[PDB]
Amino acid sequence: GHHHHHHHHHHSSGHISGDAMEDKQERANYEKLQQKFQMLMSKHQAHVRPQFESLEKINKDIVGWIKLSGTSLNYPVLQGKTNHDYLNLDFEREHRRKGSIFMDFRNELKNLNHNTILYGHHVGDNTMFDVLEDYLKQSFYEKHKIIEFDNKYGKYQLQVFSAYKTTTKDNYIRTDFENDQDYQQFLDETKRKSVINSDVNVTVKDRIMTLSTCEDAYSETTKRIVVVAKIIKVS
Ligand code: NI
Ligand code: NI
């Protein structure tokens, strides 16, 4: 008939059965929010501001939405005053190990900085940023070159051009650069590190978005997966 998932998923705790009740409840909350957002989008076909003004009623910290068709990446983007505000908090401001997909506290929304950074968990249960790992394969990249990114000030597409693995020590990412030479070096370095080949033209006149896995404090994880994309304005 008309099914969004392999199996039917109950949303009310009282009807959720089986193992991992909590995980299923967390999943239910995202499914509910995805539905609310999808209806908002289909309704405001000519704009994007109303969609987010509606989401802000839930939490003013919801500053965007990121979605990749055919994958589990379909979540609200949170932003706090630090890069750990939403590390272990969901969009309802409830404590959750996986937290939220969140934007670096330094980034602007109305007029994007040179490099906009989003962070998310990668626990390997096919949620949040687990999808970034799939980008390390050329086959997957080719079929998922465009990611949707929306915010109150516009609708964008992220044209993926680099995916690689690094350490968890690499904790300082620049949002803007001293000059074109440094930005050019960053772009060149980004393509150089990529384990996948891309034909995307990115120049110093362009803006990019960095998607990075992020781990819990005092975690054993040693590697991070990074995916970088060129930001394209849709409407
Ligand atoms: Ni079933
Ligand atoms: Ni269920």
Ligand code: NI
């Ligand atoms: Ni049932």
Ligand code: NI
């Ligand atoms: Ni608390």
